[PDB]
Amino acid sequence: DRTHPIPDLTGYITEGQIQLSRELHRKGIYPPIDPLPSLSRLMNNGVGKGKTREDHKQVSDQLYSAYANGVDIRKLVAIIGEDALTENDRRYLQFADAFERFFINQGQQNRSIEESLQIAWALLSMLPQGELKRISKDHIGKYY
C-alpha cells in the first residue's frame, strides 16, 4: 500500500523515486519499475550538459511517451486484434517490447549514462523519425 503513512511520508525526502510494482513483476518485466509513478522529483537538477548529456531530457521524455503509448496499444490489440492495428501503432506496440527487452532488462551489468542513452537511441530508431514529437530536431541530427 503506497498510501501507508511510512512510504507516503518518505516521498518528500527524495530527489528521485523509482517505484516497483508487483503487477509489473508478475508480467515478467524486470526491473519492475512503474514508468508512470517514478519521478525525477529532482531529476532535472542532475541531468544535461556538464552532468550527463544535453539530449538526456529529450530522450527520457520520448522513451516514456512511446512506452506509455505502446502499453496502451497492448490493450488495443486485445480489443481489435493484432492485424487490425495500423502500421504506425504497430511500431509503438513493438517499441514497448523493445523497451522492456533491451532497456529495462539488464544482464547484471553496470551501464554508464552514455551506455544507457545509446540503448535509448537504438530502440528509438524503431519509431518513425516523424513521430519523435518530444525530441527537438537539433538532437535528432546530432544523436539519432
Binding site: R26, K27, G28, V77, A78, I79, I80, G81
Partner: protein, 288 residues
C-alpha cells in the same frame, strides 16, 4: 492449547515446541514446526498484558509483541549442528485475523517476518479448486535459491517453465480485468487462446485433489512432466492460431480431456501426451 488453559501456557507453547524442534535438528534431522495458531497466542498474551496493566496500543495489543514474534521465527533455519552434521527447523504458522480484516495481531506482523505465504482462498474453495491456494496472492522468497536443485536433479527447464506459466496466469489476470469492463465479445482469437490455456493451467495444474489417492501427492518428476504437457499445448495452440486454426477447433481437441485427468495418472503415460498433442494438432493442420 485449549481455552481452559491459562494465557501463560499457550504463550509458552511455541517456545516449548521450537526448543523441542531445535533439539531434533541437533541430531541431524529435518523437523517441521506447525503452529496452529499465533493469532490465539497473541490474544492470550494480550490478556496477560492487560491484566498486568501494560499500556494497550492498536487493537489493545501491548507494544512488545512485534519484536517477540520476530524473535520466534528467527529460531527457524537449517544449521550445522554442534559437532558438524546438518539439521533444520522449518516453521509453518497459521494466521487467523479477528475476521477477514487481516490486520492485527496475527497476519500483519507475521507476513512481515515469514518468507513464504500460501493464501487459501475461500472463493477458490467454493469453486472447488484444490488446493485452494491463490496463485496470484501467494509468494515465496526462494525461487532462484532452489532452481539449480530442480535443474540438476529433475529438469533443466524448471525455472523457465514456471516463469512462463506465471506470465500466462499474469496475462490472464489482466485480460479478465478488461473483460470485466468491455465484455468478452471483442476478444481476438489470440486472447481467447491465452484464456483457454490459462484455464487449463488453473484446472489441470494449480488445482490438486488432496482427497485422491494419487493426486494427494505429486512427485517432482510428475510436476515437471505435467508442466511440459501444458506448456507444449500452449506453444502448439499459439502456433495453430497463427496459421488461422479456429480456436473452437483447439478448444474441443480430444487430448484436452486427457490433459485434464493427467493429475490422476500415476504413470508417465503423462509425457506421452506431448506426442499425442503434436499429432492431434497435425490432424488440425491437415483439415486446416
Amino acid at each position: 492449547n485449549t481455552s481452559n488453559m491459562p494465557v501463560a501456557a499457550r504463550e509458552a507453547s511455541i517456545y516449548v515446541g521450537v526448543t523441542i524442534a531445535e533439539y531434533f535438528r541437533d541430531q541431524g534431522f529435518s523437523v517441521a514446526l506447525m503452529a496452529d495458531s499465533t493469532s490465539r497466542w497473541a490474544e492470550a498474551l494480550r490478556e496477560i498484558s492487560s491484566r498486568l496493566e501494560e499500556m494497550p496500543a492498536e487493537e489493545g495489543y501491548p507494544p512488545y509483541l512485534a519484536a517477540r514474534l520476530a524473535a520466534f521465527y528467527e529460531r527457524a533455519g537449517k544449521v550445522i549442528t554442534l559437532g558438524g552434521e546438518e539439521g533444520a527447523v522449518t516453521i509453518v504458522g497459521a494466521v487467523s485475523p479477528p475476521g477477514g480484516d487481516m490486520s492485527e495481531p496475527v497476519t500483519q506482523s507475521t507476513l512481515r517476518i515469514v518468507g513464504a505465504f500460501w493464501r487459501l482462498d475461500a472463493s477458490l474453495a467454493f469453486r472447488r479448486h484444490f488446493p485452494a491456494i491463490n496463485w496470484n496472492g501467494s509468494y515465496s522468497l526462494f525461487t532462484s535459491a532452489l532452481d539449480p536443485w530442480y535443474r540438476e536433479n529433475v529438469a533443466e527447464d524448471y525455472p523457465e517453465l514456471r516463469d512462463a506459466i506465471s506470465e500466462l496466469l499474469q496475462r490472464e489476470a489482466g485480460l479478465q480485468e478488461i473483460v470485466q469492463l468491455v465484455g468478452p465479445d471483442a476478444l481476438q482469437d489470440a486472447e481467447r487462446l491465452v484464456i483457454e490455456v490459462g484455464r487449463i493451467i488453473r484446472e489441470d495444474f494449480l488445482q490438486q485433489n488432496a482427497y485422491h489417492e494419487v493426486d494427494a501427492y505429486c512427485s517432482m518428476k510428475k510436476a515437471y512432466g505435467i508442466m511440459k504437457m501444458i506448456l507444449a499445448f500452449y506453444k502448439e495452440a499459439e502456433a495453430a492460431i497463427k496459421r488461422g486454426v479456429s480456436i473452437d477447433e483447439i478448444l474441443q481437441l480430444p487430448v484436452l480431456e486427457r490433459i485434464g485427468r493427467a493429475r490422476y495418472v500415476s504413470e508417465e503415460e503423462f509425457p506421452a501426451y506431448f506426442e499425442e498433442a503434436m499429432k492431434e494438432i497435425q490432424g488440425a493442420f491437415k483439415a486446416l
